[PDB]
Amino acid sequence: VPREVEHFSRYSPSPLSMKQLLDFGERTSFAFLRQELPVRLANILKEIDILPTQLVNTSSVQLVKSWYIQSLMDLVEFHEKSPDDQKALSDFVDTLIKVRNRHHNVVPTMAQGIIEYKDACTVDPVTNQNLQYFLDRFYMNRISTRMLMNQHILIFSNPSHIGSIDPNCDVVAVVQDAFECSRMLCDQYYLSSPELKLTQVNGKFPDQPIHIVYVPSHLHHMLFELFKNAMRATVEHQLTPIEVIVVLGKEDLTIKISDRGGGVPLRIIDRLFSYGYGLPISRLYAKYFQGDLNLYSLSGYGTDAIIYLKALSSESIEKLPVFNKSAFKHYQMDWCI
Amino acid sequence: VPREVEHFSRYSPSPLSMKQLLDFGSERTSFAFLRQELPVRLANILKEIDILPTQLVNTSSVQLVKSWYIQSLMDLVEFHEKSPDDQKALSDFVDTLIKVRNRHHNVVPTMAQGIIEYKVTNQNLQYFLDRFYMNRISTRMLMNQHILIFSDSQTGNPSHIGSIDPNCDVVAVVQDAFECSRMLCDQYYLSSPELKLTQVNGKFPDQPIHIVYVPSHLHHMLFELFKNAMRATVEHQENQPSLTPIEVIVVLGKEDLTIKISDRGGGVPLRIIDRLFSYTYSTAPTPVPLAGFGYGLPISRLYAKYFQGDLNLYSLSGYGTDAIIYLKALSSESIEKLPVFNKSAFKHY
Ligand SMILES: Nc1ncnc2c1ncn2[C@@H]1O[C@H](COP(=O)(O)OP(=O)(O)O)[C@@H](O)[C@H]1O
Ligand SMILES: CNc1cccc2c1NC(=O)C2(C)C
Ligand SMILES: [Mg+2]
């Protein structure tokens, strides 16, 4: 329990809007990130310490802790530098690159610790819920720190993008690319893949191209995972084409992916988002900027996946976990069953 | 609270499966159960009625409902002394259930009238109304099962065991509920979307889709969802030369009977999706009725969840909406979802 971790964990993370992140396009981002990134690393670090001791003692969770601590300490060092020190700004970018490289394997490492703990230890129902609660928050936390760091790196280190954000993200283009990416893996494994039947409706601007401010990589990640499952279910169940509809409303950008891969019983639909990490992480990407990712399956026929994204950058605000009394109380935590 | 309410509220409701409710039609056994279970269920909800805000309980409407439930609780407790072999007690018990059923006939509109006086955002009121209406659904279910099996005059549908159709023709109920909504839609708009129905029997390919279910409950759910899909479709396409059909797919899987109702009625923002399932919430004004009362979605979801099913709405704002009903395909897993007044419920308030 280093002192810096305890200190910065007492701060609440500061969520940014997609709009703010566009404003990155160096002195201000530097002062903000040297404060905000330790805060977010410190908050999740403290939350790691309340996990079951046998999980925290796994080499994998110990690695994650050590990486996050080292990265926190690397960033806190810049609190002694001036935002006007142009070399400190340059060094700060190199440090974000180092931190990004150090965190490159966080997701599978953490996943390895969870699987090792679940496979080897008894997990009471409360603890199992807390693990899904923790992993949603841990992976959201990583998504957020990676977002903020890459935004600073990409801007101050694609030219048509502002950092990792596309101010006029061609949603349909991303859908088509993510489908093709999944289609390639599907052919490599199944030697055959369903085709894409894509419909687009722009309710906000009829007959006009659908564009929103969004992170295309995040959108690609969500769709890629949903397409992999739709294609794996379609081929194994059977090829019927995966039907996709992209809709832009006043407040929401909606993408619905539909297959006829036989579906799954409602009893098991929730297990899809238990930690098998692609779907839960995909949903985290959707919820990161106040979106959502829902699955509704028709057992015996097929499955619909619907992505909700905010159509306004001002409302696309980071959904960040905070290690405060409420979170700690959720861990401690009417109808007949 | 009378002593009987305090006493019987200490017991937890005993949920029954639809298979068990069918087995009642395979009399003293149902009498022995109901004379105890119905007071317990009335007593549980009577305790929660007191937790409501003073402005709502004191409404003549809620006080009436409370007075009805109390009297029905007392009517039923009168039978605790009788022997299940007393054939006259069994006959009188049927008469009492019919009296309680008739007394409770106007509970929902009375309770709704009470909410109108008290007046969507009240989380405790949503919590209570879910539990109150689920409680009523369950007590009406149990009483009607006994009445429709053992009464001399109330026989229900000859093909049902009580109110349960062991071979519920799901598609037929869909078509009937769609026509009922179409008739109402035509009255309000002089046009109605057509039905584009698809059925997939993954459990028994190409075979008719039947499950054990309460067709009246299924009809209510579909009727309410069709009323919403038709209204949204007509109004969203009112400047179009035609109406897109409402697409329905009925799927029978190993564990689930799934009904998806898809329209192109413009959808709704994700921001207000949760608000749609709130009582009274309606984009139409409150009537004195196709829409306006704001009970279609929440009550329909109660019916779906009453037997461990569910009802979800997934909307594409600017395009249309998917309403999906999940029902258990096996009667043994179709277990009552019942509220219980305990520390958890009290803490939730
Ligand atoms: N299929 C749908 N398409 C668009 N809006 C819907 C749909 N279903 C429900 N809604 C919205 O949810 C609200 C509540 O509906 P409901 O609970 O059935 O009661 P009511 O129909 O009286 O409003 C409606 O006012 C409507 O705006
Ligand atoms: C868009 N489709 C799907 C998206 C996610 C998960 C699934 C899908 N389809 C399936 O069968 C399973 C694997 C449940
Ligand atoms: Mg309605």
UniProtKB/Swiss-Prot annotation, chain A:
Site (Interaction with the other subunit in the homodimer): Y133, R137, W335
Gene Ontology MF annotations: ATP binding; protein kinase activity; pyruvate dehydrogenase (acetyl-transferring) kinase activity
Factors inducing expression: Up-regulated by prolonged fasting, in glucose-deprived cells and in response to a high-fat diet. Down-regulated by insulin. Up-regulated by PPARD.
Keyword Transcription listed: no
Binding site residues for ATP: E225, L226, F227, K228, N229, A230, M231, R232, D259, G276, Y277, G278, L279
EC number: 2.7.11.2
InterPro entries cross-referenced by the UniProt entry: AK/P_DHK_N_sf, BCDHK/PDK_N, BCKD/PDK, HATPase_C_sf, His_kinase_dom
Pfam family name, one: BCDHK_Adom3
BP terms from Gene Ontology: cellular response to fatty acid; cellular response to starvation; glucose homeostasis; insulin receptor signaling pathway; negative regulation of anoikis; reactive oxygen species metabolic process; regulation of acetyl-CoA biosynthetic process from pyruvate; regulation of bone resorption
Mutagenesis or variant effect for W335A: Loss of activity
Keyword set, alphabetical order: ATP-binding, Kinase, Mitochondrion, Nucleotide-binding, Transferase, Transit peptide
Self-association state and partner proteins as the record states: Homodimer. Interacts with the pyruvate dehydrogenase complex subunit DLAT, and is part of the multimeric pyruvate dehydrogenase complex that contains multiple copies of pyruvate dehydrogenase (E1), dihydrolipoamide acetyltransferase (DLAT, E2) and lipoamide dehydrogenase (DLD, E3).
Descriptive protein name: [Pyruvate dehydrogenase (acetyl-transferring)] kinase isozyme 4, mitochondrial
Organism: Homo sapiens (Human)
